[PDB]
Amino acid sequence: PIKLDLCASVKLTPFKPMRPPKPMQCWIHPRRANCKVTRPRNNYSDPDNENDMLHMTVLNSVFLNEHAKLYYRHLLRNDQAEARKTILNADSVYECMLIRPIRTEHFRSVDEAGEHNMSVLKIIIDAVIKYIGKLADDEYILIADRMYVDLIYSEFRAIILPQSAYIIKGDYAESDSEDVCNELEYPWKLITANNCIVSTDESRQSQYIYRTFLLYNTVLTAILKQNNPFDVIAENTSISIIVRNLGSCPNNKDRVKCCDLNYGGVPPGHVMCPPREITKKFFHYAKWVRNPNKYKRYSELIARQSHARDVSQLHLLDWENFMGEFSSYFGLHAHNV
Amino acid sequence: KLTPFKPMRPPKPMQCWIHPRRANCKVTRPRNNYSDPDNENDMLHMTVLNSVFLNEHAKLYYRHLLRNDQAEARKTILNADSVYECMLIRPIRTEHFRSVDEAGEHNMSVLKIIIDAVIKYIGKLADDEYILIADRMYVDLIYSEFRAIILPQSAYIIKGDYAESDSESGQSVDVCNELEYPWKLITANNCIVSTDESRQSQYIYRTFLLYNTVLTAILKQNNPFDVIAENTSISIIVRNLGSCPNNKDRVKCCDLNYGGVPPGHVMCPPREITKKFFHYAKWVRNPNKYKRYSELIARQSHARDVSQLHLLDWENFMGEFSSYFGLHAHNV
Amino acid sequence: KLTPFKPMRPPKPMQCWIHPRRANCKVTRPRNNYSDPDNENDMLHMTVLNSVFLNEHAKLYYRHLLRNDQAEARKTILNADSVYECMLIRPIRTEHFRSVDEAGEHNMSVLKIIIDAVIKYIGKLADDEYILIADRMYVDLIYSEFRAIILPQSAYIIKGDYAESDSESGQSVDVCNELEYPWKLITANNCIVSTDESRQSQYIYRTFLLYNTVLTAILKQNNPFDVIAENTSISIIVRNLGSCPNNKDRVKCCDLNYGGVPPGHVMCPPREITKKFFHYAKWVRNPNKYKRYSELIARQSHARDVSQLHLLDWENFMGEFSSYFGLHAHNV
Amino acid sequence: PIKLDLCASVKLTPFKPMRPPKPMQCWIHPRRANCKVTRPRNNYSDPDNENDMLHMTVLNSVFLNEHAKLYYRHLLRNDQAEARKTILNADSVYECMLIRPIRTEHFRSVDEAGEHNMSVLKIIIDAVIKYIGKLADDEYILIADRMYVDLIYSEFRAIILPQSAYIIKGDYAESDSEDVCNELEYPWKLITANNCIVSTDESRQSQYIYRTFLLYNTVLTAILKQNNPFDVIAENTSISIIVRNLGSCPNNKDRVKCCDLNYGGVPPGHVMCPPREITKKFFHYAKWVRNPNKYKRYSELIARQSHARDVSQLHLLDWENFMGEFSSYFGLHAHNV
């Protein structure tokens, strides 16, 4: 249903510039329809090309940028997938993945892994942390997909996946004014610029903590052989009820009852138990996904003050302590931070 | 439901002295270093369209024909679904382009050059390729006393294919499988079947688009043959205007109002040709039902005589027009 | 969210040879007993508008002026929010009404009678009452060589009130408390404050609406002074047309295209008068902010000299027009 | 937000042709905002005029008919309210009620009455039954307000109230073709007619049973001193869960557990226990309110066949037996039927 602004708003049938694949399915992603995997009929003289794994992912076209370029690709760098390219078909969109796993390499979806092989787990955390490192401090991001990043992973690699996210370039005009929203060529800048917002300290902290929670949710998903309900961004779903069901950390009320979760291998204990109120505020920050443009309601949210300011600062510092102990738990380094 | 996040400020000042009557035409000039008055002579028009006109490659469709660009710049930029073709311009001191809309242009030579530009623009369209306009039954543009600058056009491309007996001779590499070996192995471009008769339909279509554009240019009144709306019916418009006096098969455009001196009968195309033209045009509503109009104009629904003589009448109009402006008949 | 139930079949055939270019004008004739050819001479036009134009009494606003109806029938009927003014017509055998749109009318007398009809139609509007058009800067209608038939107009009425020292003399019964004793005791009509200066604004408004209508009638081209859209700005249109030669305070309508013989300068109203007219008109977007434009045209924002001389120039245009068509200056 | 179809779809501010009463409240209808009551400052020389009760009710404008005339008024006849008239203000609408209760008459809202004074109760049932009698057999109606009719009632009268309903004129073209959808004057009929539908036996039975259930729900509300949840037409609300909570009639599974309800005076017993599946099908029929035009989904619904046809017929006949015993319970007469 598309119309023009002339004296007759004509109904336009959404044109289909690409045969939509009828056999839509990915065995690595059985629960996902938009996820489709497939192995091409490579030149059969060469057994090597047999390994080439190809996965297309479906998604809306809004996720493309002003340049018609999909947002996660901006954060992509030194990618591991053998190749990638975008696919625009009307509102729908597709994103095919060329991969060539080595003679024995075998990827698999991060979801529901449970995997306790901290070597592979650390491979994935390195991939995701380096990827999100491409984010700028005054640039921020939300993930309308879920509260984590999808990916697959083999013993040799951890291939990232396309994400339903939205870039948002905030701008903190430092009092000492000595990347700008008006980066076009001067003529074009005369008309318009990025749909920027007002950056500030609190927004920086909010986005940083948000990406950190994304990291931790992905880590959970990796070490959860059961459902990791944290991903769920359902409108009806509320974190209040979520932690009411899950309860709080037995070892300390402050944190969540993540000690009792179901783990593919060794349970780590109350290690996976983050403070609760920080998670709550994180979910509130995440709710931004539905109205990204209205930034005043979510930009500083994780770092906002509910004295209330003292409690917010203290509990954010508690979450920072949690990140410190987490990094120590995996021998990590905050140079990415 | 999700908010369609906007990655840029939507330009509110929808002001185009070239095209005020529209809701998407905005022209505006730079305010750069004035030591160079020519830099001030620069002009900058952005038009707001819909992203649906972006192909698989994320390419605005009419840009497939932006070849030998006489204008300065043409770049695409979008605010979510909204899209924006942004134009750089720089005429010489006395050169100033103007809207084709009801231009009333009397200068024969200016019309000649403009029509040459439009015909060459549309020429590169492939034989099995078919174009459909989505805003008006005439290509839109501007024109200065010296040169002409095409304007962005909202249209959809489509590729066709046939299986002629001699399916080998000539360049057959142009196929709707325009991906790279694995990616084509995954999916192929949307495509249809092309055959000579729909090609004649398309020829008639493009030529009458050219005719509509020239009418608009030389008209000191509106061009009723330029509206692609629904309630508009070629039947009612014909009833309004009627058969042309010296040739009733034609239409009474002789009485119309041109800024240039009225040539009279010269601008009077046939009747059933325009009928089938309009019915072919109303296809655009749902191109996916392509066959419902793929062949419409030249269909044999005897009727063989009727449609072939209709083609004869159309090509008679084509040749007499071309001669009327010195155009070679071989410019098709 | 509830479905806006439709109590009638929505008439799909939006066909009006009188007004094809619009999306709501449908005309059509009866197919009744043909033994009476005059019954066939009957014509039947329904226009589709929005129910918002129905008052408290559920009365279509412009119908307040459907007095001494020269047309046959005018009834209202709605399909939920959609509304439908349905017209009966029956000209004499050779009488046939036509669209005011770009009528190019040369016949002076026909124009005279049409303008008489329009002025009398608008005359009954009360002094403290103010009208606002919602579709165009000109009253819409049709006209036969003999008579004229107004067409439905989408406009909002509003009543005003003042507290002059002599708040007793004359007929003061007309108040915005137009309910019956208890029902008025419950609620009152929406109302505003009327004062002489906004009344002058309204006089200028209505008169320039009349001027736009006459231009449309005698124009063999469109009437750019008839569009109430947003991006349209009187500033840009003025820049396009410019100061009239024999009187630069006026506008260069002399060069415009009339189906009747161009009178030239005769149709050239002042400049700032049209400016303030347009700014007054753009009020209609949100009438509830009434004061933001209630006084606009005749505001004293010295400026006393400026606005009073603007009124003088406007009334000069009014009188010279009236004399140009024999109209008495007392027909205001 | 209103636009025209010309080359510029202009945003139009909804014009306000009437001061909306700021003190919006009815003491007889404390839970209803659209309900407002008020006593006018009558000529104080006459104590008689003091009794005059005036109640305006707010509602959407869609409820008006093609003639801009509100639907319940069509069913109104020999009305008891001292006077009535409609009030169009933009989309909003109002409906003022003039009443002159006699020197001692005292009206009151039917809701939450509990009243056991079968004399007054029978007054109300007579009012409602005679009112709904104005419905034609081939004409049908739905009540988007709720699953009943609002009203007030004094010892002397039972004043009806405006309803958010929608008239629907079906048409059963009897094979022996010897009120028509095309009732306009011939010219106008040449363009259009009523938005009719295809009547039939089953639709007649469905509408009849629907109005009967409306009667019974109103009677319940009258004899319920507590909430009568049956009125509720909430989208989230399902009759399945409703009767799951309420359970079925202890005296017979067939019916509903209406024996246990809360009654202003004497409980009547399992008398108020209707068959359940009939109520279910009634609620499904009622769901039509949201898309009245699409009649194929609801018109025959109460009388439709789920053998399944045998069960539907049998259980509808059981509901008819329930109406028979109900009428006997109040000495009524089916001449209205």
Author numbering:
A (entry chain B), D (entry chain B): 7 to 184, 190 to 317, 335 to 365
B (entry chain A), C (entry chain A): 17 to 317, 335 to 365
Give the exact sentences the study uses for this entry.
The most well-studied baculovirus is Autographa californica multiple nucleopolyhedrovirus (AcMNPV). Baculoviruses have their large circular dsDNA genome packaged into an enveloped rod-shaped nucleocapsid. The BV nucleocapsid structure consists of three parts, a central helical sheath containing the viral genome, an apical cap and a basal structure attached to both extremities of the helical sheath. Herein, we report high-resolution cryo-electron microscopy (cryo-EM) structures of the BV nucleocapsid combined with de novo modeling and Alphafold predictions.
The innermost and lowest portion of the apical cap was identified as having C2 symmetry. First and intriguingly, the peripheral part is composed again of Ac101/Ac144 modular assemblies, as in the apical and basal anchor-2 rings, and in the C7 plug. In total, it is composed of eight such Ac101/Ac144 modules, of which four are unique.
